[PDB]
Amino acid sequence: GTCALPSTYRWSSTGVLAQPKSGWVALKDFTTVTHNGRHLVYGSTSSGSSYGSMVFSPFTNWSDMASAGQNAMNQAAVAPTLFYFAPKNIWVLAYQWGSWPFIYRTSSDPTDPNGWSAPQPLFTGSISGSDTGPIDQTLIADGQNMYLFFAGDNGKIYRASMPIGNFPGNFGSSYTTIMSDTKANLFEGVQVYKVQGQNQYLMIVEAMGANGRYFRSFTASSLSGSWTPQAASEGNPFAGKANSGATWTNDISHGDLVRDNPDQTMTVDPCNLQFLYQGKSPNAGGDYNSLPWRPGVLTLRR
Numbered sequence: 001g002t003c004a005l006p007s008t009y010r011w012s013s014t015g016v017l018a019q020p021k022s023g024w025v026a027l028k029d030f031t032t033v034t035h036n037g038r039h040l041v042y043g044s045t046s047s048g049s050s051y052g053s054m055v056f057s058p059f060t061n062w063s064d065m066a067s068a069g070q071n072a073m074n075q076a077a078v079a080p081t082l083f084y085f086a087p088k089n090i091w092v093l094a095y096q097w098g099s100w101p102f103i104y105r106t107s108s109d110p111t112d113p114n115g116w117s118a119p120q121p122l123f124t125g126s127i128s129g130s131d132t133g134p135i136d137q138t139l140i141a142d143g144q145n146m147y148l149f150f151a152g153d154n155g156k157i158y159r160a161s162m163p164i165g166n167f168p169g170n171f172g173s174s175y176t177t178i179m180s181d182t183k184a185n186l187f188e189g190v191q192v193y194k195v196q197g198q199n200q201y202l203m204i205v206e207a208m209g210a211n212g213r214y215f216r217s218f219t220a221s222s223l224s225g226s227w228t229p230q231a232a233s234e235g236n237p238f239a240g241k242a243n244s245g246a247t248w249t250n251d252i253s254h255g256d257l258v259r260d261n262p263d264q265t266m267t268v269d270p271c272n273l274q275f276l277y278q279g280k281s282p283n284a285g286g287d288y289n290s291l292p293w294r295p296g297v298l299t300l301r302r
């Protein structure tokens with residue numbers, strides 16, 4: 001009853017799933033789990049001037065995302081990562097920008113945008129040759145170690161680790177540079193998952209293609225191991241204009257595979273793979289920060 005990841009990906013897509021509430025021009029950078037049988041989605045927001053964050057009211061079907069309440073967080077958690085940390089029975093929301101490069105907060109109730117604890121440092125390091133600094137963290141643990149992965153808008157992917165028993169905690173300043181390519185090839189939006197039923201981990205990285213944003217995939221047998229390109233070109237992407245089946249967007253950008261198990265292992269089921277992504281009208285132009293990004297969901301066609 002186990003499935004493998006395909007070598008070539010083909011998706012079908014929803015249309016735009018929701019419009020930003022009054023005061024925002026974009027919904028972005030989604031992170032999602034299933035919580036009590038419902039979709040639980042955090043994201044960045046943009047007013048065009050600054051980024052903030054929000055959580056949607058829980059909803060059972062993606063087709064009902066359009067009517068879900070949009071609940072602003074009073075303290076911004078830009079480009080968030082949401083998961084349940086089972087060893088301490090606590091929810092974790094990690095994010096960028098504030099007192100430290102990466103930050104996290106904890107909660108016993110992840111549906112509440114303002115029930116999160118005081119911010120704690122997640123990462124305090126700095127990288128070279130980046131206009132942004134550390135960007136788009138994710139967190140993932142195996143049975144032994146908690147890993148931090150992140151990007152730098154500069155062609156590099158970075159990794160840090162600690163024994164799981166030391167988490168929640170600060171990774172500190174140290175990191176490993178694990179991948180290095182052109183800025184376009186390894187840009188941002190990095191995510192890492194355990195492939196359920198396989199001795200395999202899946203990494204996806206957002207790249208800048210000729211036709212728009214797309215994702216390149218890599219696999220590893222271990223979270224500390226080397227990453228092998230999988231579907232890693234614009235013509236044969238993990239997800240992009242070439243294979244999304246989306247008509248409303250030519251961009252497949254920063255989001256999260258749908259995680260049915262909300263825990264720190266970031267486990268995905270290759271038999272029912274879905275991708276909650278951000279896209280935008282091909283006609284939308286202007287300053288990056290003002291782009292009208294919207295949620296969509298891809299469903300893998302097997």
Ligand SMILES: O[C@@H]1[C@@H](O)[C@H](O[C@@H]2CO[C@@H](O[C@@H]3CO[C@@H](O[C@@H]4CO[C@@H](O[C@@H]5CO[C@@H](O)[C@H](O)[C@H]5O)[C@H](O)[C@H]4O)[C@H](O)[C@H]3O)[C@H](O)[C@H]2O)OC[C@H]1O
Pocket residue numbers: 097098099131132133153188288289
């Ligand atoms: O609490 C306070 C903090 O909030 C504060 O955080 C700072 C907030 O501003 C941050 O600057 C942003 C860095 O990230 C950028 O997003 C990039 C922009 O570039 C995009 O890529 C471009 C797309 O178009 C192409 O043509 C072009 O070639 C690409 O480069 C990319 O997709 C985005 O992710 C934002 O635009 C910046 O506003 C800053 O880093 C934070 O430090 O700090 C103080 C603290 O007290």
Ligand SMILES: [Ca+2]
Pocket residue numbers: 029030031079080081136137138189190191255
């Ligand atoms: Ca993310």
Ligand SMILES: [Cl-]
Pocket residue numbers: 159160161175176
């Ligand atoms: Cl490491």
